[PDB]
Amino acid sequence: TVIVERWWKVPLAGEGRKPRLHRRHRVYKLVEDTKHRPKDNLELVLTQSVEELGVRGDLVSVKKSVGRNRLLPQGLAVYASPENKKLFEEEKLLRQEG
Amino acid sequence: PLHKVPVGLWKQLRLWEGIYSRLPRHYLRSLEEARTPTPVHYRPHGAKFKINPKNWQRERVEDVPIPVHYPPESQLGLWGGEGWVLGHRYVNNDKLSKRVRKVWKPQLFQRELYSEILDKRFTVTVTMRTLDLIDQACGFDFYILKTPKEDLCSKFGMDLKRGMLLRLARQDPQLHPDDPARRAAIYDRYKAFVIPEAEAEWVGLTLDEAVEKQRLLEEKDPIPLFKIFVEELLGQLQQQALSE
Amino acid sequence: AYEWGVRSTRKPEPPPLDRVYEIPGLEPITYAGKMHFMPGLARPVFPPWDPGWTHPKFRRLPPLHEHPLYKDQACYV
Amino acid sequence: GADRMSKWTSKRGPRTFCKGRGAKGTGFHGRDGKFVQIKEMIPELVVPELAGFKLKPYVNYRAPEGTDTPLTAKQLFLETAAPAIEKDFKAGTFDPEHLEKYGFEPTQEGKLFQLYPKNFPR
Amino acid sequence: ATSVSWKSRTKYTVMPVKMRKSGGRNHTGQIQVHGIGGGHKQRYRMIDFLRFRPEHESKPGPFEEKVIAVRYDPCRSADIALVAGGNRKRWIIATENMKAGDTVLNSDHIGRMAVAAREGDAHPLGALPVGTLINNVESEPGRGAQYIRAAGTCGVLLRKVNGTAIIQLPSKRQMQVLETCIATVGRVSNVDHNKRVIGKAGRNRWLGKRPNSGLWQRKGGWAGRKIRPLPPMKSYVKLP
Amino acid sequence: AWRRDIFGRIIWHKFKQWPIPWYLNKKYNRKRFFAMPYVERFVRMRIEKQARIKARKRSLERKKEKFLQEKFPHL
RNA sequence: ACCAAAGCUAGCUCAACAUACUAAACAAAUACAAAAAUACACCAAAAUAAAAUAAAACAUUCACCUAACAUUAAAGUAUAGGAGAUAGAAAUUUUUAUCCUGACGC
RNA sequence: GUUUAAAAGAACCAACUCAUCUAUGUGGCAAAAUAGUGAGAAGACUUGUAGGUAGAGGUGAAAAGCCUAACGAGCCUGGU
RNA sequence: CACGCUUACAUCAGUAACUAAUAAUAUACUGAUAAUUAACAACCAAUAAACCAAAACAACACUAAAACGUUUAUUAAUUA
RNA sequence: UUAAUUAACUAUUCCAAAAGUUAAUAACUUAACAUGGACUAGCAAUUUCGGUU
Numbered sequence A: 001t002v003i004v005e006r007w008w009k010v011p012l013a014g015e016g017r018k019p020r021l022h023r024r025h026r027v028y029k030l031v032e033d034t035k036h037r038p039k040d041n042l043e044l045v046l047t048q049s050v051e052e053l054g055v056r057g058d059l060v061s062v063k064k065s066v067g068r069n070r071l072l073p074q075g076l077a078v079y080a081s082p083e084n085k086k087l088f089e090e091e092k093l094l095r096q097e098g
Numbered sequence B: 001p002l003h004k005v006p007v008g009l010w011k012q013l014r015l016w017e018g019i020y021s022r023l024p025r026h027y028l029r030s031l032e033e034a035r036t037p038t039p040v041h042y043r044p045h046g047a048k049f050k051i052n053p054k055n056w057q058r059e060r061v062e063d064v065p066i067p068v069h070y071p072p073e074s075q076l077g078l079w080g081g082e083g084w085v086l087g088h089r090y091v092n093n094d095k096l097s098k099r100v101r102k103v104w105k106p107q108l109f110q111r112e113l114y115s116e117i118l119d120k121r122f123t124v125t126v127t128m129r130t131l132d133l134i135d136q137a138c139g140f141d142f143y144i145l146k147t148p149k150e151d152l153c154s155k156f157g158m159d160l161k162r163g164m165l166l167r168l169a170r171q172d173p174q175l176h177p178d179d180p181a182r183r184a185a186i187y188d189r190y191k192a193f194v195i196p197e198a199e200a201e202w203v204g205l206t207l208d209e210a211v212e213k214q215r216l217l218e219e220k221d222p223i224p225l226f227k228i229f230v231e232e233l234l235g236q237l238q239q240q241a242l243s244e
Numbered sequence C: 001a002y003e004w005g006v007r008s009t010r011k012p013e014p015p016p017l018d019r020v021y022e023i024p025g026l027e028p029i030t031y032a033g034k035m036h037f038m039p040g041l042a043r044p045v046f047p048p049w050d051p052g053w054t055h056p057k058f059r060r061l062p063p064l065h066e067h068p069l070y071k072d073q074a075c076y077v
Numbered sequence D: 001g002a003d004r005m006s007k008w009t010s011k012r013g014p015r016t017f018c019k020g021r022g023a024k025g026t027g028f029h030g031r032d033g034k035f036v037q038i039k040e041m042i043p044e045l046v047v048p049e050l051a052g053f054k055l056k057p058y059v060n061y062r063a064p065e066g067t068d069t070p071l072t073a074k075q076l077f078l079e080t081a082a083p084a085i086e087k088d089f090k091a092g093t094f095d096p097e098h099l100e101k102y103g104f105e106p107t108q109e110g111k112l113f114q115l116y117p118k119n120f121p122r
Numbered sequence E: 001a002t003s004v005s006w007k008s009r010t011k012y013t014v015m016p017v018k019m020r021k022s023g024g025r026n027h028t029g030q031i032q033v034h035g036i037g038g039g040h041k042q043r044y045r046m047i048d049f050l051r052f053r054p055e056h057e058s059k060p061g062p063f064e065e066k067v068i069a070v071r072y073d074p075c076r077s078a079d080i081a082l083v084a085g086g087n088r089k090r091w092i093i094a095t096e097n098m099k100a101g102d103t104v105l106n107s108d109h110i111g112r113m114a115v116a117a118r119e120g121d122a123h124p125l126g127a128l129p130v131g132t133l134i135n136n137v138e139s140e141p142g143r144g145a146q147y148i149r150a151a152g153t154c155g156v157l158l159r160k161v162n163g164t165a166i167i168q169l170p171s172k173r174q175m176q177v178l179e180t181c182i183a184t185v186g187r188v189s190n191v192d193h194n195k196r197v198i199g200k201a202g203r204n205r206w207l208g209k210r211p212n213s214g215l216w217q218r219k220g221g222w223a224g225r226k227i228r229p230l231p232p233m234k235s236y237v238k239l240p
Numbered sequence F: 001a002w003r004r005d006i007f008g009r010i011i012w013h014k015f016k017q018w019p020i021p022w023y024l025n026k027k028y029n030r031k032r033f034f035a036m037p038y039v040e041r042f043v044r045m046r047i048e049k050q051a052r053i054k055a056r057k058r059s060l061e062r063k064k065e066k067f068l069q070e071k072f073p074h075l
Numbered sequence G: 001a002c003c004a005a006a007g008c009u010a011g012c013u014c015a016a017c018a019u020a021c022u023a024a025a026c027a028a029a030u031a032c033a034a035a036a037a038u039a040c041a042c043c044a045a046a047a048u049a050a051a052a053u054a055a056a057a058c059a060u061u062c063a064c065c066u067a068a069c070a071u072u073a074a075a076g077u078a079u080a081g082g083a084g085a086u087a088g089a090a091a092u093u094u095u096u097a098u099c100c101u102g103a104c105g106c
Numbered sequence H: 001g002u003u004u005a006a007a008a009g010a011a012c013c014a015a016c017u018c019a020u021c022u023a024u025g026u027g028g029c030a031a032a033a034u035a036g037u038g039a040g041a042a043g044a045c046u047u048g049u050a051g052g053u054a055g056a057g058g059u060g061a062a063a064a065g066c067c068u069a070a071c072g073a074g075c076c077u078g079g080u
Numbered sequence I: 001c002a003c004g005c006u007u008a009c010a011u012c013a014g015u016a017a018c019u020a021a022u023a024a025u026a027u028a029c030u031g032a033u034a035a036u037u038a039a040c041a042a043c044c045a046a047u048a049a050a051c052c053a054a055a056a057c058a059a060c061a062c063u064a065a066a067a068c069g070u071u072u073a074u075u076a077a078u079u080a
Numbered sequence J: 001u002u003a004a005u006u007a008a009c010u011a012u013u014c015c016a017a018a019a020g021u022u023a024a025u026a027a028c029u030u031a032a033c034a035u036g037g038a039c040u041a042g043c044a045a046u047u048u049c050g051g052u053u
């Protein structure tokens, strides 16, 4: 994904009308490149016992490549959303008792 | 000689007239509404007013969406709502230099994505922003059901949405005839996007497809006039019998 | 080996089915009702057309093994 | 050079171009290259007997004409099927499930000269 | 419009089929190769470059065939030879001393003993002596003799190490392949093709070579006697 | 059937008798019944031309009525 | 005296209203080489606007340039400009229905 | 047709294909002709029908030739 | 005869004028009436196999390797 | 073209992206495609040829 910005400013139109663009308004400057920024980490909760990451029921941050190629398609981990986090929380609550 | 109605409303008049009017009102309103898509390439600004760094006064700044082009090959995949950016640039980042036309294209990837509701692996040409939107929505079907048409901008995505909505509304046992418990568990975690059947089959349809479906639903053979004549004769005979 | 067929002169493979045909439990909207092509609609796959009444001249040729004189031992005529 | 206003006919073309003037085909090409005519495609002109037919191509000038009354479906029904249907309803034998005896036909492919596909020329 | 190729023939045919030459014209219609066209009417003789090809899959053992006749071929520089084996005939590229009424062997059995290298023999490279002259070599086992075919041209087997054959091509370059690549032993027929003398400008028009353009172009940096080192050995063995 | 040919016009296309269905006929398959994105301009042009013809015919009738009224003051 | 000149009509142009916008004809044939009744298919395609002008030149730029929001004002203001030629808002204001439509247009 | 064991990109010379030289013609027979006179004439040959290569190009045995009578780059329309 | 123009073709009548680059009259104008008749020509089988071996009087040859074809088995509506 | 601005495309190379491989944050490869940013050359794109003599 590329991020571009206009050189010449566009005159305003605040009455719900579309801005009156011109030929020179097509001059774009590449102000940011998303593929060049430092990539973030993907946090996932394991549903099985992985040798590399850890035991079942653990939240770990792995790189997006492995997170999308190994854990999710094979069912080794699920998303870190609260809907799936509540299940792990109740599983831990039931496990730590007996 | 002038047009009484301008050309800007001829499409709206053609929609309000013809067979287009016989379409369901929910689909008509879904096509009428014009929601601005999410900023995918241009970076928007927060506040509506801004202090001019040169003039030191308040001025209203309005966001102008940058026109993007979607090739027909984007409709066969899920590019997350982006496409080809056609524009101009100044070489060497200097205004006084020449003007050069440029076509920025997204980095395409041949990826296979598995869906839970349909239980099939589709080889869809998605991009890094598509994968990031998927991981942000925490689910392929979650992303499909949450992102609207104006954000998808993909006929393939609209077809996926319509199919999974029809499945959720009909409670199709064909999902897992062997595991009804698993079928119910899959259906329960998507109960926030339940849409009735009267509208679940009119979301991922274009104008021509909707017109064709309405034509197929309204297509009936002409009733022979013998039936109408026999009905009128029976009515007259009943009236003559009751008037005696 | 080297196959004596050329991709440009061979019969082309039918185009890939539209993305509406990969949606389980959904009937695609095609142009089979209007009996003519229109852009934007799906590609209707038609069943094998069977000429219920046998026409002599415009029918396909029956296979070799269908004939009653078809035998397993090849004869060198 | 050439013309574009006159109609493109069979005489303004080469030997390899032989377009028919509009006649209807009556057969196909055989085996040895000849033309095999089919007796089922040729129009069999069904002409009746005009010997005992007492009618002339002209009418008497003293004969009066009639008011222009186009025959319509309702009048045809009232003349043909209305009496039988009314009699059956008065007798109590009317059946809305079967109306074939009054002249109504469910489909057209049953008889020879169907109406909607228009199998007969004239 | 776009032109259609003449090569629509899936079945193999011993009889020469007709061909439609096209002078420097691609499927579009523009001239892409200068100096081709206006040639004599020529047929096309189908050549089976896969030498070791059994007739029936029931008996895949090495097989012997007999040469019928060695004829001239207008498509290539070498002379063709019709050879019949079993119930089918085929055109192959005749070697130097291949005459009418000769015996040709086609084998793929690799053995610890070296096999006597004849001219008609077609054995894998691993079973041939380390100093032989071969031609019509292959790239992969079962791919086809894409390499040397010209009249008089012949490569030389150099060494065999770790189950891998090394040959030297007419361009003095080394080619490393697997020992299962079937090749024909000996030199290609018509070794006097380079010694020929075109008598007049008419023979070029007969063969289909239009003359060069007359635009006098000054020589650039490309011209000159460039003494380049020998390129590295080209290997086809996909090492893990 | 009411068809819309490539010329943007609406025609009453009749049906012909065929021994094969519509999806197997070479002569009928390569016929196009739809409007291209370049035909709307010509459709609008024809609409404008017809509107102009009707307008000038109306003006002619109006002026002729005026002329007749000025010629015969029988009112 | 020949050659000759003169008529006032066919009709158009500009607008306002306006049903709400590809007229009538479509018996048969009409995207085979159109007006040819008749056989196992194939059908479809997009990718920025350019310059001729000005800046007495010409490279950055050059209103409209076949994309709707109209009108009275803000205002030719803030701003954008080889800071040159030129371009150019917005916030915020005004707009009361119908008939009275024909022509100091040929 | 003739010379030649020759169908030898041989030679004389017809139909045929080009156009060397001169004379008429220059709003002429003709927007490139006629007459006389020349070269090739079994081949790198002429020609009938039909298809393709399209102008930021096509093509070119380079003349910066030809691309429907004006080609240092065709014609029409639009910008105009 | 093939390609191309469509009636300019044939009979009667007239040419004061229109067309012939001029008169006569008339295949080149005007009006009317009739016309080219198929055996010649156009359209007028596939499905797989057997099929290497030139045309030049073609006996047999050279190189530039050469257009032009039958038989077999299954289906080709059967009737001026 | 040894003039001034430098395109698109094609052959180089590099980096980023993606696919991945090894071990207790580290090192390495890219078959056909393939995006963005830099490098070398062709194909080349626009413009001009100061004045008194």
Ligand SMILES: [Mg+2]
Binding pocket: A015
């Ligand atoms: Mg305002």
Ligand SMILES: [Mg+2]
Binding pocket: D001, D002, D003
């Ligand atoms: Mg003309």
Ligand SMILES: [Mg+2]
Binding pocket: D009, D010, D011, D012, D013, D014, D015, D017
């Ligand atoms: Mg003709």
Ligand SMILES: [Mg+2]
Binding pocket: D013, D014, D015
């Ligand atoms: Mg003719």
Ligand SMILES: [Mg+2]
Binding pocket: D035, D037
């Ligand atoms: Mg007959």
Ligand SMILES: [Mg+2]
Binding pocket: E072, E073, E074, E075, E076, E077
């Ligand atoms: Mg050869």
Ligand SMILES: [Mg+2]
Binding pocket: E074, E075
């Ligand atoms: Mg060759």
Ligand SMILES: [Mg+2]
Binding pocket: E212
């Ligand atoms: Mg040379």
Ligand SMILES: [Mg+2]
Binding pocket: E213, E214, E215, E216
């Ligand atoms: Mg030279």
Ligand SMILES: [Mg+2]
Binding pocket: G051
């Ligand atoms: Mg310019």
Ligand SMILES: [Mg+2]
Binding pocket: G055, G057
């Ligand atoms: Mg200027």
Ligand SMILES: [Mg+2]
Binding pocket: G056
């Ligand atoms: Mg000036």
Ligand SMILES: [Mg+2]
Binding pocket: none
């Ligand atoms: Mg401009």
Ligand SMILES: [Mg+2]
Binding pocket: none
């Ligand atoms: Mg500045």
Ligand SMILES: [Mg+2]
Binding pocket: none
């Ligand atoms: Mg200045």
Ligand SMILES: [Mg+2]
Binding pocket: none
């Ligand atoms: Mg000679």
